[PDB]
Amino acid sequence: PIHPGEILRDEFLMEFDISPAALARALKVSAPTVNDIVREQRGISADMAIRLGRYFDTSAQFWMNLQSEYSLATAYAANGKQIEHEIEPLLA
Amino acid sequence: PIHPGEILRDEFLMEFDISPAALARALKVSAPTVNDIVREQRGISADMAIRLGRYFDTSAQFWMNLQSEYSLATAYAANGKQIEHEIEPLLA
DNA sequence: ATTGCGA
DNA sequence: TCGCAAT
């Protein structure tokens, strides 16, 4: 599962030689907001998805999808088996 | 923009004649968790997406995508214009 | 209790 | 590291 911050850092920040601090100024958010994303310690909010799409000329939903897929896989790795053990599917 | 609780309510609960309280029991979550979703006052978490997919024999990512699309449109409706005013796209 | 956010 | 606000 790929944290969206890895794409942000590798596909955009490094590609265009833009620092997290420089990006935060262009996005009108605080430096720790971008830095925490790039360190893969914060997920991408809906607000951040719009800002990143707008600044980098990408789909906003592209960022939403990276996050939701990562969130789903991370939740599943943590609790998938327990959920499957306690919930019997309606087909039965 | 459709809150995922509307789909849950109309496509599943009413379709199978299952109450929010009965659904919460099958999902092993508290009744306000399901009720707040159906009243469109709470979004779908990654955990709930897994439980709903498991119980109703659907994709988990189906519920994740309903939520992410709703979250993005709601954020855009609130703040899209402000963001676009304050962020100049990197092109130029 | 956890997450996103700014200071 | 910390408090504030939303979830």
- SS3 call for B76: helix
Task: Judge whether A56 and B90 are in contact, CB under 8 Å.
Answer: yes
> Which contiguous run of DSSP H or E holds residue B47?
helix B46-55
Q: Distance between CA A92 and CA A88 in Å, rounded?
A: 8
Q: Which residues of B touch A61 (CB under 8 A)?
A: 68-69, 72
Task: Judge whether A89 and B54 are in contact, CB under 8 Å.
Answer: yes
Task: Judge whether A53 and A63 are in contact, CB under 8 Å.
Answer: yes
* Maximum C-alpha span of chain A: 56
Q: Where are the domains of chain A?
A: 1-92
Task: Judge whether A35 and A41 are in contact, CB under 8 Å.
Answer: no
Name the minimum distance, in Å, from the CA of A50 to any CA of chain B.
7
Q: Return the HEC string of chain A.
A: CCCHHHHHHHHHHHHHCCCHHHHHHHHCCCHHHHHHHHCCCCCCCHHHHHHHHHHHCCCHHHHHHHHHHHHHHHHHHHHHHHHHHHCCCCCC
Report how this structure was experimentally obtained: X-ray
Q: Distance between CA A90 and CA B56 in Å, rounded?
A: 6
Rounded to the nearest 10°, the torsion over CA A24, A15, A41, B79 is: 40
Strand C contact with A50 (CB < 7 A): no
Q: How far are the Cα atoms of A48, B71, B84 from residue A45, in angstroms, in the given order?
A: 5, 9, 17
Q: Which residue has the tokens 């402000």?
A: B82
Task: Judge whether A90 and B55 are in contact, CB under 8 Å.
Answer: yes
Chain A window 9-28, residues with Cβ within 7 A of nucleic strand D: none
Q: Which residues of A touch B47 (CB under 8 A)?
A: 75, 79, 83
Could you count the other beta carbons within 10 Å of the beta carbon of residue B74? Answer: 14
* Chain C: bases < 7 Å from a protein Cβ: 3-7
Q: Distance between CA A33 and CA A27 in Å, rounded?
A: 10
Residue B58, Cβ density class (10 Å: 0-12 exposed, 13-18 middle, ≥19 buried): middle
Q: Distance between CA A66 and CA A77 in Å, rounded?
A: 17
Could you count the other beta carbons within 10 Å of the beta carbon of residue B38? Answer: 20
Residue from A46, A48, A19, A18 nearest A33 by CA: A48
* A60-86 and B60-86 helices, crossing angle to 10°: 150
Tell me how many residue pairs between chain A and chain B have CB atoms under 8 A apart. Answer: 104
Residue from A64, A73, A83, A8 nearest B73 by CA: A64
Contact A47 B75 (CB under 8 A): yes
Among B29, B52, B87, B91, the strongest candidate for a mutation testing the A interface, having the largest count of A CBs within 10 A, is B87
Contact B55 A16 (CB under 8 A): no
